[PDB]
Amino acid sequence: CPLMVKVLDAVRGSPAINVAVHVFRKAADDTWEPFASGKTSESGELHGLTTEEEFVEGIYKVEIDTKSYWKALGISPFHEHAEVVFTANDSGPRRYTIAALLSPHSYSTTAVVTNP
Amino acid sequence: CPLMVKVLDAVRGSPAINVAVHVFRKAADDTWEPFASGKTSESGELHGLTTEEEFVEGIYKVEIDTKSYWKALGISPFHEHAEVVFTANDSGPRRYTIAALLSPHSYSTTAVVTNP
Amino acid sequence: CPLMVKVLDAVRGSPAINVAVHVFRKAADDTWEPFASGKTSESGELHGLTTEEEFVEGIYKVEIDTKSYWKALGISPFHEHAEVVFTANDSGPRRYTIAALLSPHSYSTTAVVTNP
Amino acid sequence: CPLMVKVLDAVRGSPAINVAVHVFRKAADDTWEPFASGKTSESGELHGLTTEEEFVEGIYKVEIDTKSYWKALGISPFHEHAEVVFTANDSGPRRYTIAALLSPHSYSTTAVVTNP
């Protein structure tokens, strides 16, 4: 599990559950290749996205569908989603946790990177 | 204006207006002395808090009355307020902006420090 | 000035100056059309991006070239940049400020939306 | 474990390890009663702070000594520490996780609150 995603609701102070996440890879022809996807769990975390063998070096894009999240909560947010674009394992493969903290008009995203 | 405070509402995507702010300075006898205070303006900013003559080297605490903010909006938040403790002008006077971004269950505070 | 961008350096506690910003609008054919761009000023703010006549209803993407920022500071960051996708003026024109707060391995983005 | 604390470094994108945390309780005579304390672990988390029996309703203050953290890293930060003040279990006892995201001139803190 070299890539993980974690979403929190800054308003309710809880994990955002059942939040849709889409991962893409920068295509060699500078286009966005779909790579993985899934929805967050009860704990606001999405595991088992990819494997070490398929998570190779390159440029990645993580999209958290935050517009669907707030609406379902009875809200109407500002953003469409959140977008974390980064280069992966250019230094050897690390574990990547992408955390997101969401609010209707604001978000934060942190990349926690670790060695085995 | 050597010390200013700016507050944003991360839920409404707007200035936080009429927000109470208390500034304190760590006393020689190691307790907190009331230094200054006010409420934010319609731009969610607070000006004319102190002066260069009065804003000397020292340890400062900025308390933003954020619990009273939320409730007045028709909400009920988590924190009693936001707190920012920092040492100032320990290398000459600077202009200090303390900006806060508030959510009922989370907040962020940034110090923008500029030279004359 | 219906759309403005403001960037802060969460490490240095200062404006992020000369930062590249690209704005795009979701095309009818569902691709991203270049809408506007510039670099931040010494106050880390970017003005005169578009106009009321040109800033119509639509889905917008604000990309802040934050990877180029850090490296130019003598650093090497995590993200390729910051991304903010949002729908604008879907209830009339508003003034939109997109503020970003950057760290090599994390960032936050806030939309301050005001009425005339 | 009704109270937990988690610290992340927004600069290195890693857990902050061995970070000192101090918890206090609002004394009935409006003073700050020490309640618990400890340093974060390898994973940037501090567990076993208190117990359900001793974590009663009231106003609490969590202080993360961030000035010692950065310095040890070869830095000299801005803040003295971070300060999360909140009322606990006024609705029945929840588990409280206090997360902090630190940068030399900025910090964020989120209260993730859960039911058994």
UniProtKB/Swiss-Prot annotation, chains A, B, C, D:
Effect annotated for changing residue 15 to S: In AMYLD1; amyloid polyneuropathy
Modified residues (4-carboxyglutamate): 33
Effect caused by changing residue 50 to K: In AMYLD1; amyloid cardiomyopathy
Keywords: Amyloid, Amyloidosis, Cytoplasm, Disease variant, Gamma-carboxyglutamic acid, Glycoprotein, Hormone, Neuropathy, Phosphoprotein, Secreted, Signal, Sulfation, Thyroid hormone, Transport
Recorded consequence of changing residue 59 to L: In AMYLD1; amyloid cardiomyopathy
Disease: Amyloidosis, hereditary systemic 1: A form of hereditary systemic amyloidosis, a disorder characterized by amyloid deposition in multiple tissues resulting in a wide clinical spectrum. AMYLD1 is an autosomal dominant form due to transthyretin amyloid deposition. Protein fibrils can form in different tissues leading to amyloid polyneuropathies, amyloidotic cardiomyopathy, carpal tunnel syndrome, systemic senile amyloidosis. The disease includes leptomeningeal amyloidosis that is characterized by primary involvement of the central nervous system. Hyperthyroxinemia, dystransthyretinemic: A condition characterized by elevation of total and free thyroxine in healthy, euthyroid persons without detectable binding protein abnormalities.
Name of this protein: Transthyretin
Species whose genome carries this gene: Homo sapiens (Human)
Encoding gene (name): TTR
Span covered, complete protein: 30 to 145 of 147
